[PDB]
Write an enzyme that holds these catalytic residues in place. Structure first.
Site, PDB file in Angstrom:
ATOM      1  N   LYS A 240      31.702  34.721  22.670  1.00 32.14           N
ATOM      2  CA  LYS A 240      31.332  35.998  23.259  1.00 32.14           C
ATOM      3  C   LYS A 240      31.961  36.125  24.637  1.00 32.14           C
ATOM      4  O   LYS A 240      32.382  35.130  25.223  1.00 32.14           O
ATOM      5  CB  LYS A 240      29.810  36.098  23.378  1.00 32.14           C
TER       6      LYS A 240
ATOM      7  N   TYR B 247      40.123  39.392  57.074  1.00 34.83           N
ATOM      8  CA  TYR B 247      39.058  40.404  57.203  1.00 34.83           C
ATOM      9  C   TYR B 247      37.792  39.832  57.806  1.00 34.83           C
ATOM     10  O   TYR B 247      37.303  38.846  57.317  1.00 34.83           O
ATOM     11  CB  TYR B 247      38.649  40.986  55.838  1.00 34.83           C
TER      12      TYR B 247
HETATM   13  C1  LIG Z   1      44.202  47.502  49.445  1.00 36.44           C
HETATM   14  C2  LIG Z   1      44.717  47.902  50.794  1.00 36.44           C
HETATM   15  C3  LIG Z   1      44.417  49.238  51.235  1.00 36.44           C
HETATM   16  C4  LIG Z   1      43.192  50.123  50.917  1.00 36.44           C
HETATM   17  O1  LIG Z   1      41.911  49.568  51.434  1.00 36.44           O
HETATM   18  P1  LIG Z   1      40.512  50.089  51.407  1.00 36.44           P
HETATM   19  O2  LIG Z   1      39.646  49.242  52.328  1.00 36.44           O
HETATM   20  O3  LIG Z   1      39.872  50.166  49.970  1.00 36.44           O
HETATM   21  O4  LIG Z   1      40.598  51.456  52.031  1.00 36.44           O
HETATM   22  C5  LIG Z   1      45.314  49.882  52.142  1.00 36.44           C
HETATM   23  N1  LIG Z   1      46.379  49.159  52.632  1.00 36.44           N
HETATM   24  C6  LIG Z   1      46.661  47.815  52.312  1.00 36.44           C
HETATM   25  C7  LIG Z   1      47.741  47.052  53.059  1.00 36.44           C
HETATM   26  C8  LIG Z   1      45.795  47.154  51.317  1.00 36.44           C
HETATM   27  O5  LIG Z   1      46.197  45.855  50.869  1.00 36.44           O
HETATM   28  C1  LIG Z   2      25.875  32.376  24.563  1.00 28.08           C
HETATM   29  C2  LIG Z   2      24.869  31.739  23.676  1.00 28.08           C
HETATM   30  C3  LIG Z   2      25.169  30.421  23.237  1.00 28.08           C
HETATM   31  C4  LIG Z   2      26.043  29.358  23.992  1.00 28.08           C
HETATM   32  O1  LIG Z   2      25.484  28.648  25.209  1.00 28.08           O
HETATM   33  P1  LIG Z   2      26.130  27.707  26.096  1.00 28.08           P
HETATM   34  O2  LIG Z   2      25.107  27.187  27.101  1.00 28.08           O
HETATM   35  O3  LIG Z   2      27.347  28.367  26.827  1.00 28.08           O
HETATM   36  O4  LIG Z   2      26.623  26.700  25.100  1.00 28.08           O
HETATM   37  C5  LIG Z   2      24.463  29.933  22.097  1.00 28.08           C
HETATM   38  N1  LIG Z   2      23.485  30.748  21.585  1.00 28.08           N
HETATM   39  C6  LIG Z   2      23.116  32.002  22.029  1.00 28.08           C
HETATM   40  C7  LIG Z   2      21.924  32.730  21.466  1.00 28.08           C
HETATM   41  C8  LIG Z   2      23.847  32.545  23.120  1.00 28.08           C
HETATM   42  O5  LIG Z   2      23.491  33.874  23.522  1.00 28.08           O
END
Ligand SMILES: *Cc1c(COP(=O)(O)O)cnc(C)c1O
Ligand SMILES: *Cc1c(COP(=O)(O)O)cnc(C)c1O
Lengths: 359, 358
Positions: A34, A255
């Protein structure tokens, strides 16, 4: 160049199935795939595994994509069907189905199918998530045995809520309830997933459902990896450096000015961020392999870059290989560092990363 | 019926123009990197024919836009990672940032059928990408001597603390960006969402709206998009797959982590972190079941989330659930979980189905 990419080792898949057959020798295997096979690829993980006795999913959407890709094995709908109209598709496609409510039951009682379905009556044994409660199961179960639209016998499934905590009597209380209900009944019994497999050999029964451990990653609430059980890291989250720059003492990187350098050094910039699925929560110091040698993340992880401290005269350079986790660096080590669950780390990735399959 | 992101195309174009009202003398670089912040790379581009260019992180991503028929200039915000990539970039009329020696030397010796437009990335304080100042007037001079580069050379930079108006980071960072651009032709650009909303002296020729374009605030101060006249574009939705009885003293989830102090009814949502919902979400977080707010109870899981409906509640499997969206800004969910709204809307998996309305 390569930025971001998940490399899937088919040879390790292969082996942890076997290695799991060795750990649960008297039980059939329900390979749980899944959520895009835990980030490894739904269809490609299934094709890597002509041996699973079956495949487990969450949703139908997901089982139907198996079929669409050519997978022929029995697929188990772990949560069931969400709508009574999909019961004709279920029986046609030969899906097996959990049944946890009286809507799914009522829907099988009345539907007119061409072939009967194989069913597993989900029993709530302590998780209190999905399943019929004890005090309600004996009557629910009996109605399933009288469906001409369900395949006899009715199988019984359940799931552990705290199998990774051997010291609390959780698991053993669910097992007690599971055993009491399944007393005198035919058809089959799951209750064990990765944890129950590794740690509780008394809850293997007829079918075990390996999920996270299948991929060589560990279920556990501690610092055990898949190698602790002979199971082998399937995935490698990789990328490349897109820059190696000079940096000076007292200067922050990135940042919020989260990290400030105490020395002149060289910083590497990785083509990896949270827009790919890498945790934004990763603190400075988190390990990352650059040319196979560990360097720390310095600064906030951005949407599509990550900075690392290489050293004041390192010789790394744009284009060089970076490993976020994989061979040399487990995901369990990146989980302990970040404080994020290995389950989420390998699964919550976006479509931006390329998928490669090896061996 | 289940995990789904509904994208309001109407809110998307309201925002672009809202933003042109806030930055009236600047051209717009719609930032659509990382699958347009959750929203869909190509469908977000097709919803905005109006915007003056599109910004992406990687070249992969620009190419995917051209493949879908998008034809506005695209700006490679991080430049190109390989020289064998200049020929594609030139023909496809991608504009690029140039921050290192490799990229510049590549431009110097490529042979190309057309010149490529460039934005020299200057490091003014972020210390992430870009040419440092001591080092930038050379870098610069070499780009104006390229016949592979379409003149004039444009200048770009990015803020590392624009959402913190009280520290002098930005005004330190602008000071540097302004000393270097003294006397030089070619466009200037340094402002993204924060710079656009809080620093009008920073708009210059081009602004690069990202997060705000989707109606989400860039400050972690508890404000929304609406707080700038921008409308939320995304709604993370799903449905209940079960409504079960539960009793006092009983836990729920991995690690029996929430324990109920009453007899109640629990709802199970077809949503988990295998879809992109934060596993870190604490019990409490708000969900909207049936347009009514209920709390998450228990650990969140790969594919299901439990909520407390009440002892007597008449919600029913099948019923609509909103993780965020209309009754519930993603900013509220970020405050309740301690994730960044940036990550919440962007780190979703491929299992989300995508709907577009209006
Ligand atoms: C991704 C990014 C943006 C836009 O940023 P926001 O915080 O979502 O507005 C603008 N310029 C550069 C250089 C970026 O890497
Ligand atoms: C996802 C899930 C599993 C697997 O579990 P793990 O801890 O990742 O092995 C088995 N049975 C059900 C019902 C699940 O939803």
């Amino acid at each position: 160049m390569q930025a971001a990419t998940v490399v899937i080792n088919r040879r390790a898949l292969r082996h942890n199935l076997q290695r799991l057959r060795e750990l649960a020798p008297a039980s059939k295997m329900v390979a749980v795939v899944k959520a895009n096979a835990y980030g490894h690829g739904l269809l490609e993980t299934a094709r890597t595994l002509p041996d699973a006795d079956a495949f487990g999913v969450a949703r139908l959407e997901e089982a139907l994509r198996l079929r669409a890709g050519g997978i022929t094995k029995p697929v188990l709908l772990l949560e069931g069907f969400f709508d009574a109209r999909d019961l004709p598709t279920i029986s046609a496609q030969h899906f097996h189905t959990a049944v946890h409510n009286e809507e799914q039951l009522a829907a099988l009682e009345e539907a007119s199918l061409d072939e009967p379905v194989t069913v597993w009556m989900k029993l709530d044994t302590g998780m209190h998530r999905l399943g019929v409660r004890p005090e309600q199961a004996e009557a629910f179960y009996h109605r399933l045995t009288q469906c001409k639209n369900v395949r006899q016998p009715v199988n019984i499934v359940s799931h552990f809520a705290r199998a990774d905590e051997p010291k609390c009597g959780a698991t053993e209380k669910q097992l007690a309830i599971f055993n009491t209900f399944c007393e005198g009944k035919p058809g089959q019994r799951s209750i064990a997933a990765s944890g129950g497999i590794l740690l509780w050999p008394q809850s293997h029964f007829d079918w075990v459902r390996p999920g996270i451990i299948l991929y060589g990653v560990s279920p556990l609430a501690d610092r055990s990896t898949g190698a602790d059980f002979g199971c082998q890291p399937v995935m490698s989250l990789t990328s490349s450096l897109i820059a190696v720059r000079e940096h000076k003492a007292g200067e922050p990187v990135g940042y919020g000015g989260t990290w400030v350098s105490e020395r002149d050094t060289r910083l590497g910039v990785v083509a990896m961020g949270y827009g790919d699925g890498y945790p934004r929560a990763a603190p400075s110091g988190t390990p990352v392999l650059v040319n196979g040698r560990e360097v720390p993340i310095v600064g906030r992880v951005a949407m599509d870059m990550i900075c690392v401290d290489l050293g004041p005269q390192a010789q790394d350079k744009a284009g060089d290989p970076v490993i976020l986790w994989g061979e040399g660096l487990p995901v369990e080590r990146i989980a302990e560092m970040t404080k994020v669950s290995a389950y989420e780390l390998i699964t919550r990735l976006t479509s931006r990363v390329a998928m490669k399959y090896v061996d």
